From Swiss-Prot, chain A:
Changing E386K: Partial loss of protease activity. Changing E87Q: Severely reduced protease activity. GO terms for biological process: cellular response to heat; protein denaturation; protein unfolding; proteolysis; proteolysis involved in protein catabolic process; response to heat. Gene3D superfamilies: 1.10.8.60, DNA helicase RuvA subunit, C-terminal domain, P-loop containing nucleotide triphosphate hydrolases. This is ATP-dependent protease ATPase subunit HslU. It comes from Escherichia coli (strain K12). Keywords: ATP-binding, Chaperone, Cytoplasm, Nucleotide-binding, Stress response. ATPase subunit of a proteasome-like degradation complex; this subunit has chaperone activity. The binding of ATP and its subsequent hydrolysis by HslU are essential for unfolding of protein substrates subsequently hydrolyzed by HslV. HslU recognizes the N-terminal part of its protein substrates and unfolds these before they are guided to HslV for hydrolysis. One of its GO terms (molecular function) is ATP hydrolysis activity. It is found in: Cytoplasm. It holds the Pfam family AAA_2. The gene is hslU.
UniProtKB/Swiss-Prot annotation, chain B:
Keywords: Allosteric enzyme, Cytoplasm, Hydrolase, Metal-binding, Protease, Sodium, Stress response, Threonine protease. The lineage of its organism: Bacteria, Pseudomonadati, Pseudomonadota, Gammaproteobacteria, Enterobacterales. The gene is hslV. One of its GO terms (biological process) is protein denaturation. It holds the Pfam family Proteasome. Protease subunit of a proteasome-like degradation complex believed to be a general protein degrading machinery. The complex has been shown to be involved in the specific degradation of heat shock induced transcription factors such as RpoH and SulA. In addition, small hydrophobic peptides are also hydrolyzed by HslV. HslV has weak protease activity even in the absence of HslU, but this activity is induced more than 100-fold in the presence of HslU. HslU recognizes protein substrates and unfolds these before guiding them to HslV for hydrolysis. HslV is not believed to degrade folded proteins. This is ATP-dependent protease subunit HslV. Optimum temperature is 55 degrees Celsius.
Length: 393, 173
C-alpha cells in the first residue's frame, strides 16, 4: 500500500522547488516497484526497474530529488561519481564497489534503524534490572495471590523516586548497552539489509556524461567507455560479492545524471542507452526560484538559521525584500563569476549571517530583523568586487 | 572558399560557397560549408577540412554542453583545446560561429575574434565578401540574409576559389 505518483510528487514538493517533470519521473519509478510486487511470479522476473537519466545544470535539484525519493521510500541510497572509475587505468577502483558501498550503507541503516527501534524498551527493562537491585521479591508468589500479590507498592514509588531523581543512572546506561545487545539478532539483520539493497536499492550515478566519447583521443575514450562497460552488468542484472553476502543488482533502481553540454545521451554506449529508458530535463533556476528555495522548503535554510539562532535565545526574522535581496545576490555572483546553482545561496546566506551568528549568544533575548537594508549593507560590496567574489562567495 | 556572417535586427546568418579546390581544378562544387549545432541554437561555418570541421564543430558543441551555452566562453575553451592537443593542433581550418547573443571567429592559433558589427568574412574571398557586405549594411536596409547572400555572390565573382553554390543558415530572436 504505497503512495501514488501524485502523492510522491507532493511529498517531494515539500523539499524541492520546481523541477516537476523530474519529480513525476522519479515518481513513476517508485510507483512501478509497487506495481511489480502486484504481479504473478512470471512477470515479476521480467519487469525490471525503469532507470532514469536526469539531464540538467549543476545544483538545480538532481541529487536532492534522488535523495528525497530514497528517503520517502525508506530505501537504502548511495551517490557515486562516474569518473571515479576512469582512474582504474592507473589503479582507480572497480564498479562493484558501488553495490558493495551501497550494501554497507544499507547495513548501517538496518542497524541504526533497528537499534533505535529498541533503545526505549531496553531502558524500561533496564530499570526493571535496577528496580530489582532495590527490592527483589522475585520467584513465584511471596505473599498473597490477589491483594498482597502485587509487589509494585513500594517498588512503584521506588522506581519513580529513581527515574525523576554504581549510581542508578550510571548503572542503567551500562544495562542499556547490555540489554539492547542482548536483544539484537545479527543473523537476519545481515540478510535484512541485503533484501533492502535488492528490492529498494537506489544508486545515483553522477557525471554520466563525463564517461562519454568525444573525438578527443583513443586512450581517454577507452578509459571512459570502459567505465560504461563495467557498469553494464550492474544495470543489466548481475550478482555482486558483498562483505555481508551476495546481492543481485537485478532490481536496484538507477538514476544517472548528466549536464550533456559537451556530450549527448546518444554518445552513451548502446547497451546503456537501452537501460536508461527514461529521459528527463531539469531547468536552470531563476531568481524567483531562488527566493522560494530560501524559504518554502519545510526545512529551508532560512528556517534552519532561524532555529539555530533561537538556540541562542535570539529571534531572527527575514523580510520579503530581505529574501529577495539575498536571492539576487546569489544570482548576481553566479552570473558575474561561475554559476553553481542553488549552492550559491548557502555561501551567500552564510556570509550574510556571520556577524550575528558570532554575536548571537550576546544578543540573547533580542529581536533581530534581517531586512533588505541589512542584506545590502553586508553583501553588495562583495557581490560587486568580482575577484573578491571568487574567494568569499 | 568564402564564409560570410551578418547580423541585422533579430536575424543573424552564416553563408558559405560550395567550391572545394585542389591545385587549379575544382574537386567538388557543392560542399556544405555551413551547418546547425547545439539543437539548432548555434549556426556555424567552416573554411577548410570538410572533416576537420566535423571534429571541431562537435568538440565545440561539447563546450556549449556543460558551460550553460555561453557562446563566447565555450568558444575560447575550444580554441584552448584546439591550440593545445596534438590531435586538434594538427587540423587547420577557419571557424565562424554565431548565435542569438553574438557571432565570432575561432582559429587554430587559439584565437577568438569578434569583428566590428558581428560581420564575419573568412576564406580566400572573405575580403571581397566584407567589402560588399559593408557597402550594403552601410547604405541599405536589406536584411541580414539579403546582404550575406548578395555579398557572397560578389565574392564568388572575384575569387577564383569560390563558386556560387550557397548554403545559408539563419537564427531569429
Amino acid at each position: 500500500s504505497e503512495m501514488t505518483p501524485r502523492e510522491i510528487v507532493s511529498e517531494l514538493d515539500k523539499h524541492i522547488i520546481g523541477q516537476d517533470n523530474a519529480k513525476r519521473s522519479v515518481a513513476i519509478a517508485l510507483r512501478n516497484r509497487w506495481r511489480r510486487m502486484q504481479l504473478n511470479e512470471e512477470l515479476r522476473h521480467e519487469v525490471t526497474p525503469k532507470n532514469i537519466l536526469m539531464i540538467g545544470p549543476t545544483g538545480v535539484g538532481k541529487t536532492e530529488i534522488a535523495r528525497r525519493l530514497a528517503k520517502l521510500a525508506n530505501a537504502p541510497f548511495i551517490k557515486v561519481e562516474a569518473t571515479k572509475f576512469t582512474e582504474v587505468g592507473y589503479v582507480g577502483k572497480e564498479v562493484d564497489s558501488i553495490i558493495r558501498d551501497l550494501t554497507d550503507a544499507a547495513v548501517k541503516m538496518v542497524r541504526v534503524q533497528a537499534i533505535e527501534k529498541n533503545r526505549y524498551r531496553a531502558e524500561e527493562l533496564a530499570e526493571e534490572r535496577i528496580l530489582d537491585v532495590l527490592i527483589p521479591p522475585a520467584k513465584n508468589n511471596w505473599g498473597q495471590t490477589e491483594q498482597q500479590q502485587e509487589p509494585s507498592a513500594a517498588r512503584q514509588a521506588f522506581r519513580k523516586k529513581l527515574r525523576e531523581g554504581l549510581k542508578i543512572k550510571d548503572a542503567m546506561k551500562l544495562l542499556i548497552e547490555e540489554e539492547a545487545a542482548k536483544l539484537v539478532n545479527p543473523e537476519e539483520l545481515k540478510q535484512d539489509a541485503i533484501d533492502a539493497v535488492e528490492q529498494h536499492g537506489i544508486v545515483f550515478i553522477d557525471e554520466i556524461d563525463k564517461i562519454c566519447k568525444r573525438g578527443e583521443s583513443s586512450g581517454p575514450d577507452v578509459s571512459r567507455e570502459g567505465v560504461q562497460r563495467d557498469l553494464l552488468p550492474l544495470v543489466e542484472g548481475c550478482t555482486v560479492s558483498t562483505k555481508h553476502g551476495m546481492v543481485k543488482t537485478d532490481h536496484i533502481l538507477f538514476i544517472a545524471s548528466g549536464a550533456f553540454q559537451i556530450a549527448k545521451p546518444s554518445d552513451l554506449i548502446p547497451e546503456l542507452q537501452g537501460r536508461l529508458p527514461i529521459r528527463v530535463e531539469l531547468q536552470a533556476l531563476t531568481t524567483s526560484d531562488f527566493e522560494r528555495i530560501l524559504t518554502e522548503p519545510n526545512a529551508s535554510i532560512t528556517v534552519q538559521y532561524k532555529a539555530l539562532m533561537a538556540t541562542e535565545g535570539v529571534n531572527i526574522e527575514f523580510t520579503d525584500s530581505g529574501i529577495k535581496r539575498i536571492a539576487e545576490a546569489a544570482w548576481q555572483v553566479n552570473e558575474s563569476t561561475e554559476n553553481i546553482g542553488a549552492r550559491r545561496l548557502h555561501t551567500v546566506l552564510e556570509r550574510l549571517m556571520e556577524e550575528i551568528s558570532y554575536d548571537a549568544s550576546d544578543l540573547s533575548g533580542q529581536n533581530i530583523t534581517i531586512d533588505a537594508d541589512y542584506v545590502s549593507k553586508h553583501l553588495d560590496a562583495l557581490v560587486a568586487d568580482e575577484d573578491l567574489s571568487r574567494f568569499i562567495l | 572558399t568564402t564564409i560570410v556572417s551578418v547580423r541585422r535586427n533579430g536575424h543573424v546568418v552564416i553563408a558559405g560557397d560550395g567550391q572545394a579546390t585542389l591545385g587549379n581544378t575544382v574537386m567538388k562544387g557543392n560542399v556544405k560549408k555551413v551547418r546547425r549545432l547545439y539543437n539548432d541554437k548555434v549556426i556555424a561555418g567552416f573554411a577548410g577540412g570538410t572533416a576537420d570541421a566535423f571534429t571541431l564543430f562537435e568538440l565545440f558543441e561539447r563546450k556549449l554542453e556543460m558551460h550553460q551555452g555561453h557562446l563566447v566562453k565555450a568558444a575560447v575553451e575550444l580554441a584552448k583545446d584546439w591550440r593545445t592537443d596534438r590531435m586538434l593542433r594538427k587540423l587547420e581550418a577557419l571557424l565562424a560561429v554565431a548565435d542569438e547573443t553574438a557571432s565570432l571567429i575561432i582559429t587554430g592559433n587559439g584565437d577568438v575574434v569578434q569583428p566590428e558589427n558581428d560581420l564575419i568574412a573568412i576564406g580566400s574571398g572573405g575580403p571581397y565578401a566584407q567589402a560588399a557586405a559593408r557597402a550594403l549594411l552601410e547604405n541599405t536596409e536589406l536584411s541580414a540574409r539579403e546582404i550575406a547572400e548578395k555579398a557572397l555572390d560578389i565574392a564568388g565573382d572575384i575569387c577564383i576559389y569560390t563558386n556560387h553554390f550557397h548554403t545559408i543558415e539563419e537564427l531569429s530572436y
